[model samples]
Target: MTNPKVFFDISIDNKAAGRIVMELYADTVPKTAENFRALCTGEKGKGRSGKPLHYKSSVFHRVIPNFMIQGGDFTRGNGTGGESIYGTTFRDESFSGKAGRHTGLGCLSMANAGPNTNGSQFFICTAATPWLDGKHVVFGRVIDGLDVVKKVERLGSSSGKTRSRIVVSDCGEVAADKS
Candidate 1:
């Protein structure tokens, strides 16, 4: 069966910063994506929005310059402190032939342990991570905001906290044309 397509217009502080369009694999990884989308919408169910889920609060936790910047660590505002929300794990989705290649920039991928331990965490690549080929779930790609992403990457960081804030503003479904 064909999966549903979910597009997101990622804005930073009300300005259109970037677009993330993904053909959501509801059949293959339903729980994972659903949970992430819920967080984006602030319907955490458990009332987890102690604060707004902005990008500034999300520091570029781990930056491997020329490789990728790993964030989504909700605890320390980096990669080490967030709770794994998915509870259960699933097998990694089969990679599309061109998926793992990271042919361009601003590709978004799920950060997981083993195959399907992905919960509410993701990372964007600053440069191609060819070594990660077929290892992580590349659910979507950034069609716009390459410049914003570059700016986010340029922000200085010390001890995992970004020197400058880069907030997400808001994230949700958007029309493809806006991409």
Candidate 2:
């Protein structure tokens, strides 16, 4: 799809909890963005939506306080568990200094072993991570609700089996308000 400005009004239990607006780099990473969009739309897998997608179950699997909180793994129950339903992996794009910079808080990025191994996992930073520099794919930035992310970061770790789970509940294109 053409580059789209994606916004998420995230909530807990149907309550208006928080919101995040992001300019998705669909043009730069078409397959990645399309895959993510499919996940958000519940078109990727079964039982992947509703309560299963809630942040409560998805916890921030990895946290380097003052640096970043990494989650989004669907298998390990931490944040390192996502592969395409077909077990597909994308090629890592060359390190683009322009893309990986953490210019603001609440930046969402792909989590990978090398470069393009990025499949289903992602992370969001509560604070800027400059060291990441040219390593990860900087696909989107959080335009709102940085505080919510911080709150998520403060959760106690889940021993070593997993990080505290944070449910995503649901994510989708934001509707316009004409009122």
Candidate 3:
């Protein structure tokens, strides 16, 4: 089977922003990819915190222009509360050869507090951020809707705050044949 593809139909302050299609590198980062894929589908049910293990209705809490936009904290929604399918946290999958890197735009990487501290939180790079290599596990990349990411980027401030509420209104895996 091929790698899984997921999508997020974003909205900013109640207005639709468009959809972002991401391709997970399951062949290389299977554990990490599966974590995110299942979260998008919410198939694993409630997390350790008792909140739904889903990315739906979550907000991209941090938005740094020309850098990245972070989210996936469905519980707290403020950058602190999210759990993996395994538990409140899990091990970092990979960060070596052939593993995804935060080298350019659309790179999707885990947002951890420290080593082996990965949870449900993640971020999408809007520009190359090679300084994070080996520190965070990159599991996927946005294959479509770069412009939509830019649209969100435009709403960000130098302080990493967005002018409007950027939310993932809907999210789930997409068919392989989908565009």
Candidate 4:
């Protein structure tokens, strides 16, 4: 099945910063991709008691302009919080033969505290990040709204909030969930 395309709206101060549309790499990193796709729908995952583990209203807890903008922690709104669709941590499936090198500007890579520590946290490369080769799992790339990504990237660069002040609205799946 063709991978699902996701669209995320990132904003600050409750103002629009444009939309970021990306195609999840379900083909290569199947497990990593599904985890994020499920989180987007807020329909599947081990989150709050009865609520969804959606990325809705999540903050960019970590920001380093010219580097990357990170988010996906919907629980604590901090970089330290967030869980997978399965409700726990998982191993890594990064840089497989099918996984290519980090060559794009809006590359979507998983953020982990250590090896195989992927959860829901992720980062979008603002520029060419050759240094990230083999360090993170390359799941997808931003197919649209490169400008909006840069906008969010800027917001995160100087962001030193205890909890990120930049609110990233949850995304939606454009195609049916085939996974």
Which numbered prediction scores highest in lDDT against the true structure?
3
Write out the backbone clash pairs for model 1. Answer: 54-168, 55-166, 55-167, 55-168, 56-166, 56-167, 73-78
Per-residue lDDT of 1-179 in model 2, one digit per residue for the tens?
55555544544434545655556667666665666666555454543322232222344467665556676666666544566433546765544543657665677777887766876677677677777767777777676677776665665353422233345654665534545
Could you tell me which 10 consecutive residues in candidate 2 have the lowest summed lDDT? Answer: 47-56
lDDT of 3 at 20: 96
Model 4, 39-121: lDDT tens digits are 87777744643446788788778777777878887766778878887655778886975355775578889888888788788
Clash counts for the predictions, in order:
7, 13, 0, 1
> What's the residue-level lDDT of 116 in candidate 3?
96
Error of 2 at 1 (Å): 6.9
Best by TM-score: 3
Listed per candidate, the RMSD to the true structure in angstroms reads 5.0, 4.6, 1.7, 3.1
lDDT of 1 by residue, 1-179 (tens): 34444444434444555644444444555555555555455444332434433232354456554556576655556554444343333556557654445544676677776665664567777777777777777755556556666756665344334544445544554423653
lDDT of 1: 0.55
TM-score of 2: 0.72
Stretches of candidate 3 off by over 4 Å are: 176-179
Q: Give per-residue lDDT, candidate 2, residue 86.
A: 34
lDDT by residue (1-179, candidate 3, tens digit) is 47899999999999999999999899888998999999999999988788999999999988988899999999898898899988889988888654646758899999998999999999899998888899889998899999999999888888888778999999999866846
Better of 1 and 3 by TM-score: 3
